[PDB]
Symmetry: C2
Subunit: 163 residues, 2 copies
């Protein structure tokens, strides 16, 4: 399986909207179902800062994953970046999460020269947790009733990777 | 003596002076030498019932400030954040408790928030004592979270739950 990584752009709006519109994908991050292609196309054209990088994983031209890294906008926090709820993959277990996470960390380390990369993950998302720890993330805190998922408040682990 | 009021244009000058005190600015994430200029552009065009900013006044002088912001995302909207917390000129004079107690009244009785979040520097004992007094519990410790006095310092990630 050949996986190209690309900067999320106009030509990807349709596939990415579809990726996060899958209830099984959305519930593991903070997205809501039924998002519009046009509302996302907007937020895209309403984006231009190089401190926010959004990558899409592709197969035969289809968006099968996505991840983002954003350096904090505040000067006293600018040595850190966040990848949010993490990697969003549709094809789990086929190396997409690793391809995306490795590429984002490469940028953080070697190009932005960030000292700290932060993320949050649902405490029961064992597969995601295993991936993040493989890449150097450690749990720093546990946040109770952090977000809504499946009609109830669930916890997330707050993680960080220091360089 | 201490009057609490909604932060508006009338206060931009006093609030700016507040943060220009390095002893105040260093315990939060603000930068010194801010100018009434950029703040006004921020306030006078930035209005949601989600963000509440208060200023503590004594004889018309801004001696303290704090803000509560309900998270914008639907799946996180049951929570709110007060950032690095309470920014006070007079430590020990009861300005912090005044401000915080009032933001929590709004959070509990009007917004009906289930979770309020904050971060505080690990070595700021009086602030930690204040947040603990109001029900906040430490949920995690974040290493090299921000810059303070030319070095990376840690913070405690705290949350106050209402169930």
């Amino acid at each position: 399986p050949t996986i190209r990584l690309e900067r999320y752009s106009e030509r990807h709006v349709e596939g990415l909207t579809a990726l996060y519109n899958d209830p099984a994908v959305a519930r593991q991050v903070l997205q809501m179902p039924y998002q519009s292609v046009e509302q996302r196309r907007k937020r895209l054209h309403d984006s231009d800062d190089d401190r926010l990088l959004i990558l899409v994983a592709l197969h035969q031209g289809d968006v099968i994953g996505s991840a983002s890294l954003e350096q904090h906008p505040r000067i006293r926090r600018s040595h850190s970046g966040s990848i949010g709820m993490g990697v969003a993959v549709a094809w789990q277990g086929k190396g997409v999460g690793s391809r995306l996470l490795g590429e984002l960390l490469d940028i953080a380390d070697n190009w932005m020269n960030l000292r700290r990369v932060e993320l949050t993950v649902y405490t029961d998302n064992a597969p995601a947790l295993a991936l993040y720890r493989k890449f150097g993330f450690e749990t720093e805190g546990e946040m109770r009733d952090y977000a809504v998922r499946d009609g109830r408040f669930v916890d997330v682990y707050s993680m960080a990777r220091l360089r």
